[PDB]
Amino acid sequence: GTVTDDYLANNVDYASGFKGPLPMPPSKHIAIVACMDARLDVYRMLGIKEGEAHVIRNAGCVVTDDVIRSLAISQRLLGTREIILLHHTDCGMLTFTDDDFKRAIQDETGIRPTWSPESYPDAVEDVRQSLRRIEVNPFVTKHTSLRGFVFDVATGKLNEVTP
Amino acid sequence: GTVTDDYLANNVDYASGFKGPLPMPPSKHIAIVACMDARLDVYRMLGIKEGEAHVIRNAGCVVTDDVIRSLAISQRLLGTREIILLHHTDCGMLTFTDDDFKRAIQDETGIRPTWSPESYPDAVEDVRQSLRRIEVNPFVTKHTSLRGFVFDVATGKLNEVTP
Ligand SMILES: [Cl-]
Numbered sequence: 001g002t003v004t005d006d007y008l009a010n011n012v013d014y015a016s017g018f019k020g021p022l023p024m025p026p027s028k029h030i031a032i033v034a035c036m037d038a039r040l041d042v043y044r045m046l047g048i049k050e051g052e053a054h055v056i057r058n059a060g061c062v063v064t065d066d067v068i069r070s071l072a073i074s075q076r077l078l079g080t081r082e083i084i085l086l087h088h089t090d091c092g093m094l095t096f097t098d099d100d101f102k103r104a105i106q107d108e109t110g111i112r113p114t115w116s117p118e119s120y121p122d123a124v125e126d127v128r129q130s131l132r133r134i135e136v137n138p139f140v141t142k143h144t145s146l147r148g149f150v151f152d153v154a155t156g157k158l159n160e161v162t163p
Numbered sequence: 164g165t166v167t168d169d170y171l172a173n174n175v176d177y178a179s180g181f182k183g184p185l186p187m188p189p190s191k192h193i194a195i196v197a198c199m200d201a202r203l204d205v206y207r208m209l210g211i212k213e214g215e216a217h218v219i220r221n222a223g224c225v226v227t228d229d230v231i232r233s234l235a236i237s238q239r240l241l242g243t244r245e246i247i248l249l250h251h252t253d254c255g256m257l258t259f260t261d262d263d264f265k266r267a268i269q270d271e272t273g274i275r276p277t278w279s280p281e282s283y284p285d286a287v288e289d290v291r292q293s294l295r296r297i298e299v300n301p302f303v304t305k306h307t308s309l310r311g312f313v314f315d316v317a318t319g320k321l322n323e324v325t326p
């Protein structure tokens with residue numbers, strides 16, 4: 001069997017004790033943007049319960065156009081008004097560079113991706129940068145709170161970053 | 164205070180129980196592509212433990228270039244070889260079409276987004292189209308298992324989708 005079979009079996013247990021359905025709009029009107037990193041259980045990290053929060057995740061917790069899209073939909077159609085950005089210490093994007101990453105891919109495949117791999121060398125700096133990307137975007141404006149943090153993978157603590 | 168404030172207070176208790184750091188690569192070598200939807204606790208849904216899985220989430224669980232980027236990074240740099248794709252019953256991605264959404268935005272802001280909103284009419288059929296995007300993408304080739312599921316917000320059950 002595979003891990004997917006394993007996780008599917010776990011879903012049976014989850015299903016048996018499931019309470020639902022809940023309304024679609026986030027009850028706590030908040031959106032989290034975070035990293036796909038395996039060590040971030042975003043829900044337990046923030047004490048989130050089902051139905052409270054949108055959670056968006058990608059490699060590097062990068063504010064791409066997909067995140068902008070997802071946030072726009074979140075705010076305009078589902079009434080979220082707060083945004084938490086999560087980066088973290090020891091994160092994957094610190095270990096590599098775009099130019100090297102695309103070069104390796106072109107070696108194997110013969111082509112370079114059209115998209116940017118969006119690596120960055122410093123978590124704290126990039127939270128600031130990430131905050132600036134949301135601030136300057138004309139479609140994500142319905143928030144009354146926008147704050148960014150670095151999750152410490154060694155201690156579990158969230159440390160705020162000043163824009 | 165704000166919801167963000169309450170969530171930070173939750174993190175204090177989280178960090179109290181925290182055990183780390185864990186190694187960066189996912190210990191189960193699997194990536195989950197899921198939805199930001201507030202009713203999906205992806206970790207609990209699949210019995211996921213910290214350090215085991217990459218979890219990617221956006222609006223509508225769409226395989227955008229950002230998801231391909233994140234999968235490519237996940238596979239090439241951090242060794243994942245299984246992919247689980249999730250959609251969900253009762254999509255808010257049904258309630259709107261792209262063109263309508265974009266028009267509303269342009270009416271409000273004067274500006275039309277460059278990005279596709281990526282709405283779809285049917286979750287099940289779009290799981291099939293999602294699976295197809297990954298399979299024919301040249302940058303996400305390393306997986307040995309690629310499977311898609313619709314998550315029922317009323318029962319908590321995953322229903323696999325076949326191509
Ligand atoms: Cl999550």
Ligand SMILES: [Zn+2]
Nearest residue numbers: 035037091092
């Ligand atoms: Zn990371």
